[PDB]
Amino acid sequence: NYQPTPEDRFTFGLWTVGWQGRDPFGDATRRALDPVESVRRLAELGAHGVTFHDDDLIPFGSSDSEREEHVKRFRQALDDTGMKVPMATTNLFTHPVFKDGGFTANDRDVRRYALRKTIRNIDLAVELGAETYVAWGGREGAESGGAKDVRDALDRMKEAFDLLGEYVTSQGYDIRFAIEPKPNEPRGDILLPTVGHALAFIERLERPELYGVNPEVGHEQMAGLNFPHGIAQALWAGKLFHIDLNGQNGIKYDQDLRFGAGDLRAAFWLVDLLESAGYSGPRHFDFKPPRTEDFDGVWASAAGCMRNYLILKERAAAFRADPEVQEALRASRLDELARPTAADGLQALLDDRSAFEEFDVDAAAARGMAFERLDQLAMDHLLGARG
Amino acid sequence: NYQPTPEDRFTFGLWTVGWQGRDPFGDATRRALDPVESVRRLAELGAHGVTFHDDDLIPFGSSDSEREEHVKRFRQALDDTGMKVPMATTNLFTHPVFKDGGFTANDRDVRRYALRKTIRNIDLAVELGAETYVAWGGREGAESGGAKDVRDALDRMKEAFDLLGEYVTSQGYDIRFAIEPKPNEPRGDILLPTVGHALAFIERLERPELYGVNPEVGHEQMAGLNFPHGIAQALWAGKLFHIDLNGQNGIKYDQDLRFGAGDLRAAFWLVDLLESAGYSGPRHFDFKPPRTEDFDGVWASAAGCMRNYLILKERAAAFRADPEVQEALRASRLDELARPTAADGLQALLDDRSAFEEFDVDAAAARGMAFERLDQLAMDHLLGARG
Amino acid sequence: NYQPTPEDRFTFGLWTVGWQGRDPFGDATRRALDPVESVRRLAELGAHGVTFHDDDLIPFGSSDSEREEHVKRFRQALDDTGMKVPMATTNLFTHPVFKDGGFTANDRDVRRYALRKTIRNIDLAVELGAETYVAWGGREGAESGGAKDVRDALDRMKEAFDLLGEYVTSQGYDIRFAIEPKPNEPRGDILLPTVGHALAFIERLERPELYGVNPEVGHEQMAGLNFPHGIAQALWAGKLFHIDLNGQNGIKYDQDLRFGAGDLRAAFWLVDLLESAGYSGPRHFDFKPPRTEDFDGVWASAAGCMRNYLILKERAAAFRADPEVQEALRASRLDELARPTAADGLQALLDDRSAFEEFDVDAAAARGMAFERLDQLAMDHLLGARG
Amino acid sequence: NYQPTPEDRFTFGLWTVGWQGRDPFGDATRRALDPVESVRRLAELGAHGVTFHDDDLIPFGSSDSEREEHVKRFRQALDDTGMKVPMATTNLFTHPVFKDGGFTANDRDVRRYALRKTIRNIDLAVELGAETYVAWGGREGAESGGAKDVRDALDRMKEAFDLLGEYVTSQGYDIRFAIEPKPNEPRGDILLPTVGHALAFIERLERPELYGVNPEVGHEQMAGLNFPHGIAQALWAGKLFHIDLNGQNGIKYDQDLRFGAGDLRAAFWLVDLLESAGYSGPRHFDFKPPRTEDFDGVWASAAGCMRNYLILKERAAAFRADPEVQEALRASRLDELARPTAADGLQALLDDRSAFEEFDVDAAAARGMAFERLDQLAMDHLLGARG
Ligand SMILES: OC[C@H]1O[C@H](O)[C@H](O)[C@@H](O)[C@@H]1O
Ligand SMILES: OC[C@H]1O[C@H](O)[C@H](O)[C@@H](O)[C@@H]1O
Ligand SMILES: OC[C@H]1O[C@H](O)[C@H](O)[C@@H](O)[C@@H]1O
Ligand SMILES: OC[C@H]1O[C@H](O)[C@H](O)[C@@H](O)[C@@H]1O
Ligand SMILES: [Mg+2]
Ligand SMILES: [Mg+2]
Ligand SMILES: [Mg+2]
Ligand SMILES: [Mg+2]
Ligand SMILES: [Mg+2]
Ligand SMILES: [Mg+2]
Ligand SMILES: [Mg+2]
Ligand SMILES: [Mg+2]
């Protein structure tokens, strides 16, 4: 039951199942995985493809010769298996040179290096077939208020993404960028901390059509925000290029639990939205098998990601298909929300006495919204206490 | 010492000093204030002006005759005193008819009523001299996931603000709109929950130049965000039309404490930013004297708002004027943050071997940022342990 | 399906279904309910009993004659219907006289009044059959640091509960006290903010055996704490006298959603714990039907409270009864957690070389805990994707 | 100005200034420090002493010979310099064998090993002069609900601390234990998550007089709690054995900023409480110089810890010594809070008609608390805008 196949478009970062379990207070609990082995094991689980940072695939500081040997091995696992690489990204956060940022480091020479490191990996990503290039500015930010002039830092951030867009357009590459927001950790505050701030920033870039967002469930929840609502606003803007699925239990450190763990009802409403809106991009899992687990547990946690997506998809489809739920949606006037408020125009509205002068405010105030009955039908479907 | 005068542009809502102290668990502890009395008492404290909701000034349901008597009394207090009215707003949240929203209520007839109520008060605000019209969509949102289709709700929100912009432009009014974000309370989640989401939304309106943000200190802190950083992004976008100053102790209910209470260091960095960026708009206090206080305490809390702004202004000016701080800023390379990363252009950067091939990553990694010494100088200035 | 009956011991406060919907920003949306009507409607839904504050039943300031008429009406609804009154409490928070607290108000005369008001309602509660008397110190606390000397306030809090214990013991009443913690709202910080602080405080009272806790789901979640863990510690101490069930979406204002809404997985683990530990007290719902709802929605929300408890009970029972889950629990060594670490004693442990000198740390480090497979079985049972 | 001397009792963990800057997303940015060098550098800064984990001083897995060489070097730096070692603790969190806990690991053999590792370091701590032995159960907890039966885990936690108390009493050691709470990180939820839960747990131990708390500023703030209030409750119980001072900006990952950073007003009220209550224990800094810093920044951040304590001490002393503040405290009735509510006894209170029958509730309700004027005097003193 609930068996994933490549058509479900489930994808995984090399850094997810490959996380060795080193955390701020503890050493690694698992050995390093060979990327070739992860490709083959994920293929057998029913995954559609993999993603990577440059440094997940090619050890930092590798010669041009060593680099080619790592890429060739990886390509032949893709060719043998035929896993896809739909997305790639840059590691601008692990090496000590990035301790104050990549694109917004105060030192100019570090910012130039960050751009050259990124451009080198765009070339590789395009060769392997990636459609989306993600940027997570995990070191862009500050612990203290004087350390970063944020207007200048946003100028530098805009400069960097503008240069990246000039690069891809001059090369003729068919690849788009997706900014992944996070509010904090590892910096005290990170720039562009939510989906909203990232969407707003994109609108000031020279070629906004090249850029969208890669929101992550747990990151928006680290600010206590409603993740389905934020995804809805990204869809409404035409900017949901990619998505990171995982779980998070509230406002605390970034947990990266397996999808379905954490806020289960938010996961239900997210899947309902993605499916009913026809999102066609990868369902990418950015998660960490807990460091309590051995390698059997790594693969069980990865399988659980896909399983929980497939169960929630089934329950959301059943919810929307239920005639009793359609009747409830009409009783709560969700259909009236889709009608224009004033398609008759401003002048008609101003002359309409039934909209103000003769509006019966007390009758309208007395109508119940019937929202609790609707939400209990949704609870019943989620729990399988009806079909 | 630290005496406010009208040139400091301090303003107050009628609903602030006039809050009677009714909270979710308690009855009012203070009598209602006459708006005429608040104007006169604020004038004597050194305030520049007042702001209002329609329902603060004119009791809901008032006849056209009663309405004119309330406005005439209020205008003559302004004329006698000569207080300014720089901003006004609409109450689309108190009456039970708005229990599911104004602009995004599921019922169409409520949405039309909300627009007519707003338009009536724009006319009045323009008559009294307001430059900014604020919208706080406090009821726009949901407690449960099925109650609100958020893409349709954003269509309705866009429709409403587009109609407002068509109204002011057809009337020839010189007034701009400012959206005030809040993440939650009184709804479980409120639409456009942060400064970033509001900035992003504005860019999809038909006439974006008419709209900006009115951020509030405590609202962004209810999402755990860095308020000076968010203000910096609003300034960078050209959208800081107005600001609400107050205090908040972390992630919890909206406290609306007096400015300076709550996160004191964030208040210091906010004042440093506003003054050094040359913000010229009103310094508006959206605060609630705690319901423990009698009327003497109301006016003492209001005076403390202005006093704390003036003290912080002095300390921030002293910080920036200190040659030892200028030297610290150079040691942390804040001046290098303002230089373009690659004004030599993309092709020059790609051919620069000192940016990648010959970049000494380990030397760059070893440089300290000297951020702690800078932050301790800022602490010393804030505390007056140097000048 | 999932039909509640009186044997399920579901109870409701008069103030829950009777909440008129007035919040910090809005007027009431529903008329006041007659307590007699709530008793009869809850009886028909399958409730076991009701609870009350003094002021829910007898209007504040009522004469001794008026008081008796309200009590007589209420008793005859109980007698006709035969609903139980298992718990009662005092309103020490609504009236303006309590704006700085009841038991810990700075004014001594208010503290004496608070004690006399409480004692009067203990007499009534005992007459109606209550086994537990709850105290929620919602006004005990502060918005600012100088307002409350917290050591003196804890002396006064101890004095008050000691006097209450002296009163009940001198009267021969068979009633115990339960302290209900809350971290904030309506005060900036409330004293005894969590289950842990309340348990610690009880141990300094003169007769600790008379006092326990009444934890509320949403209150502990307002501090981001794990509610099942806190309930486990209260059970371990022998102090879980009563419980408030409801839902809360994270760290924000107190939502009091219907049980099952909010953190659904935490609700599953809570019901699993209560049932497997044999909790025999009332399952009390302290919830507010959202003010969007009319009276049909009030009763639907109340029915949903009980329904969700009964569904979760069924899924947790199925989880624990599944032999595949029992095998998973053994694979994760939950059975070894129940064995004493060192029943052989300190001297034996010190002389055991297999515990340190010859302990193979690397073999032990390599064992996986198999926690993810266990948690996915729990997810499958919760969702009804196995039985 | 504000120069620390050994009489100020400032202490530092070896792991604080010695933190190499490795975080969840990044490699170390600083070389390892020799403990001998930290002792000498801290002595020159004016520190009173140092603290350590076993593994900070003796590399894990060291032979008995190697162990003695590390201890001898360290002792001679203490003897030459004469720094104190007032506290020590055990590392039960870094090694992979502790991935599921030390004292509450599901595997019994790990729990026995954890106890033997702890006992070995108690012997050493007593030899070096430590008065307090801290336990931070950073791995005791869970990411998922089924992984840990919390009642059994609390039995095992009690068993372990009881065995430790039996050990120290049988040896005749003059050392007490202090439990350091933390709500989460690195586990999803940690057992005994706040000061309150730790105080409650102590009361169930066999010899409660041997155990107290070591609260940390930032840990309680990770739950949004008021740290001075929690310290007040620990003092009221007689259990504040030790304290960790640092800074934290709200609810997020554990930042361990330098003391004074983070919530500055809470730091003021904390120092006011510690000094006015006569706390005589070490002022211990558990902080991490940010990984942006080189070694000059490490020592500047450490000096700033002590400086900010000394400045806040001066401002709090000036606040309490100001006759205008004493008058404000009387106006807010802080002196009435210290009088017993009912030293005349229960029977006198019940017969006092001025406490209920003839209590003028409306006059009492009308008195203002004057809390805002008091808090603005506190703000003025903190900022040095009066003396
Ligand atoms: O490349 C982007 C990825 O980089 C890092 O691993 C982040 O932790 C993860 O959030 C993000 O998706
Ligand atoms: O008009 C806008 C104002 O309306 C309401 O009173 C809000 O509580 C306040 O945040 C806002 O500034
Ligand atoms: O009597 C105790 C009750 O009183 C109040 O209504 C509180 O809001 C609720 O939390 C509590 O259970
Ligand atoms: O030994 C106790 C110490 O151990 C760990 O380093 C903790 O991170 C710190 O909070 C604590 O004070
Ligand atoms: Mg993450
Ligand atoms: Mg991610
Ligand atoms: Mg507010
Ligand atoms: Mg506001
Ligand atoms: Mg509640
Ligand atoms: Mg309750
Ligand atoms: Mg810490
Ligand atoms: Mg600590």
mmCIF file with all atom_site columns, C-alpha atoms in Angstrom, chain D residues 175-217:
data_model
loop_
_atom_site.group_PDB
_atom_site.id
_atom_site.type_symbol
_atom_site.label_atom_id
_atom_site.label_alt_id
_atom_site.label_comp_id
_atom_site.label_asym_id
_atom_site.label_entity_id
_atom_site.label_seq_id
_atom_site.pdbx_PDB_ins_code
_atom_site.Cartn_x
_atom_site.Cartn_y
_atom_site.Cartn_z
_atom_site.occupancy
_atom_site.B_iso_or_equiv
_atom_site.pdbx_formal_charge
_atom_site.auth_seq_id
_atom_site.auth_comp_id
_atom_site.auth_asym_id
_atom_site.auth_atom_id
_atom_site.pdbx_PDB_model_num
ATOM 1  C CA . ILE D 1 175 ? 29.943 19.054 47.235 1.00 0.00 ? 175 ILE D CA 1
ATOM 2  C CA . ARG D 1 176 ? 26.371 19.706 46.095 1.00 0.00 ? 176 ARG D CA 1
ATOM 3  C CA . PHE D 1 177 ? 24.658 19.039 42.763 1.00 0.00 ? 177 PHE D CA 1
ATOM 4  C CA . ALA D 1 178 ? 22.973 21.575 40.486 1.00 0.00 ? 178 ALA D CA 1
ATOM 5  C CA . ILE D 1 179 ? 20.680 20.555 37.621 1.00 0.00 ? 179 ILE D CA 1
ATOM 6  C CA . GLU D 1 180 ? 20.885 22.833 34.561 1.00 0.00 ? 180 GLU D CA 1
ATOM 7  C CA . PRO D 1 181 ? 17.547 22.863 32.651 1.00 0.00 ? 181 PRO D CA 1
ATOM 8  C CA . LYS D 1 182 ? 17.125 23.421 28.916 1.00 0.00 ? 182 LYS D CA 1
ATOM 9  C CA . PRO D 1 183 ? 13.834 22.974 26.985 1.00 0.00 ? 183 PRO D CA 1
ATOM 10 C CA . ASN D 1 184 ? 15.212 21.616 23.683 1.00 0.00 ? 184 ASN D CA 1
ATOM 11 C CA . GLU D 1 185 ? 18.360 21.292 21.471 1.00 0.00 ? 185 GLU D CA 1
ATOM 12 C CA . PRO D 1 186 ? 20.026 18.960 20.718 1.00 0.00 ? 186 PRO D CA 1
ATOM 13 C CA . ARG D 1 187 ? 16.989 16.745 21.446 1.00 0.00 ? 187 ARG D CA 1
ATOM 14 C CA . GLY D 1 188 ? 13.556 17.721 20.116 1.00 0.00 ? 188 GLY D CA 1
ATOM 15 C CA . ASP D 1 189 ? 12.336 18.010 23.724 1.00 0.00 ? 189 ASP D CA 1
ATOM 16 C CA . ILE D 1 190 ? 14.652 17.640 26.738 1.00 0.00 ? 190 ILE D CA 1
ATOM 17 C CA . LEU D 1 191 ? 13.437 16.214 30.059 1.00 0.00 ? 191 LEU D CA 1
ATOM 18 C CA . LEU D 1 192 ? 13.198 18.695 32.969 1.00 0.00 ? 192 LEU D CA 1
ATOM 19 C CA . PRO D 1 193 ? 12.884 21.547 30.450 1.00 0.00 ? 193 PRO D CA 1
ATOM 20 C CA . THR D 1 194 ? 12.656 24.559 32.805 1.00 0.00 ? 194 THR D CA 1
ATOM 21 C CA . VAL D 1 195 ? 13.707 25.726 36.265 1.00 0.00 ? 195 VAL D CA 1
ATOM 22 C CA . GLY D 1 196 ? 10.249 24.814 37.543 1.00 0.00 ? 196 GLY D CA 1
ATOM 23 C CA . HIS D 1 197 ? 10.357 21.200 36.323 1.00 0.00 ? 197 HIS D CA 1
ATOM 24 C CA . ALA D 1 198 ? 13.860 20.758 37.781 1.00 0.00 ? 198 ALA D CA 1
ATOM 25 C CA . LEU D 1 199 ? 12.805 22.193 41.179 1.00 0.00 ? 199 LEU D CA 1
ATOM 26 C CA . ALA D 1 200 ? 9.789  19.879 41.233 1.00 0.00 ? 200 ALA D CA 1
ATOM 27 C CA . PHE D 1 201 ? 11.897 16.832 40.361 1.00 0.00 ? 201 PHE D CA 1
ATOM 28 C CA . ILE D 1 202 ? 14.431 17.542 43.170 1.00 0.00 ? 202 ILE D CA 1
ATOM 29 C CA . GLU D 1 203 ? 11.660 17.216 45.732 1.00 0.00 ? 203 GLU D CA 1
ATOM 30 C CA . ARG D 1 204 ? 11.222 13.537 44.855 1.00 0.00 ? 204 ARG D CA 1
ATOM 31 C CA . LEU D 1 205 ? 14.899 12.625 45.356 1.00 0.00 ? 205 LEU D CA 1
ATOM 32 C CA . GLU D 1 206 ? 15.952 10.694 48.450 1.00 0.00 ? 206 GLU D CA 1
ATOM 33 C CA . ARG D 1 207 ? 18.157 13.519 49.819 1.00 0.00 ? 207 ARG D CA 1
ATOM 34 C CA . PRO D 1 208 ? 16.708 16.734 48.337 1.00 0.00 ? 208 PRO D CA 1
ATOM 35 C CA . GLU D 1 209 ? 19.010 18.981 50.407 1.00 0.00 ? 209 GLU D CA 1
ATOM 36 C CA . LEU D 1 210 ? 22.007 17.949 48.213 1.00 0.00 ? 210 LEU D CA 1
ATOM 37 C CA . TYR D 1 211 ? 20.459 19.264 44.958 1.00 0.00 ? 211 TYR D CA 1
ATOM 38 C CA . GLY D 1 212 ? 19.611 22.669 43.513 1.00 0.00 ? 212 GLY D CA 1
ATOM 39 C CA . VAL D 1 213 ? 19.434 24.331 40.099 1.00 0.00 ? 213 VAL D CA 1
ATOM 40 C CA . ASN D 1 214 ? 21.957 25.971 37.772 1.00 0.00 ? 214 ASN D CA 1
ATOM 41 C CA . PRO D 1 215 ? 19.613 28.076 35.589 1.00 0.00 ? 215 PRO D CA 1
ATOM 42 C CA . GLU D 1 216 ? 20.910 29.672 32.399 1.00 0.00 ? 216 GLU D CA 1
ATOM 43 C CA . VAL D 1 217 ? 19.593 33.014 31.100 1.00 0.00 ? 217 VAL D CA 1
#
